[PDB]
């Protein structure tokens, strides 16, 4: 089953699988696709076409083949896809057994 997680900019995300399971990322986006999510100043929530597909790769590297993963959604990991638009991290993933 696919699990979904979301964390606003500067806040941390923790993807977690029960017991000894492996995290397998299926989707990951750091940017903006909705104006009513992750409150901010109205003008900082304008762009709705802010997408960063590199997040899929970055998330997979930092989380795949692990039991739990954690990433702060910010300038520490991802760069600035839509400068001036408060971004958010949306990661979908499924828990699978080891080899």
């Amino acid at each position, epitope marked *: 089953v696919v699990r979904r997680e979301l964390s606003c*900019e*500067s806040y941390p995300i923790e993807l977690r699988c029960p017991g000894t399971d492996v995290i397998m990322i299926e989707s990951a986006n750091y940017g903006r696709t909705d104006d009513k999510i992750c*409150d*901010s100043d*109205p*003008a900082q929530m304008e762009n709705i076409r802010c997408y960063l597909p590199d997040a899929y790769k970055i998330m997979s590297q930092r989380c795949n083949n692990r039991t739990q993963c954690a990433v702060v959604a910010g300038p520490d990991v991802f760069p600035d896809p839509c400068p001036g638009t*408060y971004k958010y991290l949306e990661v979908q993933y499924e828990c699978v057994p080891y080899h």
Partner: antibody
């Protein structure tokens, strides 16, 4: 040594009409960059009056028509501290000034969930 | 900037205050003399952490309201509303809730 969200204000004191004063709102436990800093004042026995804000994220600023031209708000994110420079002070500016924060990412859409202790500015000759 | 409006009330009463200052961005605050204000309700209807359940907010058109279901002794103070008017913030005039005797 344990962290906590707190807004500590400094810079208050006595000024003479036409003079100037600098108020400072130092932030602990969160980053001003991910917040909008507002100054709100209250004269003795009166209501709350918002004066000015700054959102270091986009650095846009807004000022109350009563303070526009005499008051300038700014922020230094490397010091996690917002400032309110008040020039050409007049008697009607006498009031306790409180700095407040709107933390992004919590649903508040403008709410102020942490205020400073407040500092008093008395503008009189 | 005006001085707070007065509302004489008794323990057990129900007070429904309406906001006049201009978004869905209404927030309500309680202040007692000599202390900084405290957030009660944000985003029209959301109860802030640690605030008693008796406090509530609602929206009916341009009519945003703060309602205390049952007045308790420490609820007697001044209450302010806030509205995000584009690039401007506007507090209401204030309601000081005083006791009847």
């Amino acid at each position: 040594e344990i962290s906590e969200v707190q807004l500590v204000e400094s810079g208050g004191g006595l000024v003479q009409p036409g003079g100037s004063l600098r108020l400072s709102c130092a932030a602990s436990g969160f980053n001003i960059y991910y917040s909008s800093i507002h100054w709100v004042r209250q004269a003795p026995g009166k209501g709350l009056e918002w004066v000015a804000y700054i959102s270091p994220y986009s650095g846009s600023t807004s000022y109350a028509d009563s303070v526009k031209g005499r008051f300038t708000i700014s922020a230094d994110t490397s010091k996690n501290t917002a400032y309110l420079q008040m020039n050409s002070l007049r008697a009607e500016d006498t009031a306790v000034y409180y700095c407040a924060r709107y933390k992004y990412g919590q649903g508040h859409m403008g709410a102020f969930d942490y205020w400073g202790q407040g500092t008093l500015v008395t503008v009189s000759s | 900037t005006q001085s707070p409006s007065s509302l004489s009330a008794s323990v057990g009463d129900r007070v429904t205050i309406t906001c006049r200052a201009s978004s869905s961005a209404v927030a309500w605050y309680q202040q007692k003399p000599g202390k900084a204000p405290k957030l009660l309700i944000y985003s029209a209807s959301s109860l802030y952490s640690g605030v008693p359940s008796r406090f509530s907010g609602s929206r009916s058109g341009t009519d945003f309201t703060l309602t205390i279901s049952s007045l308790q002794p420490e609820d007697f103070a001044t209450y302010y509303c806030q509205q995000s008017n584009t690039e401007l913030v506007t507090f209401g005039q204030g309601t000081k809730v005083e006791i009847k005797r």
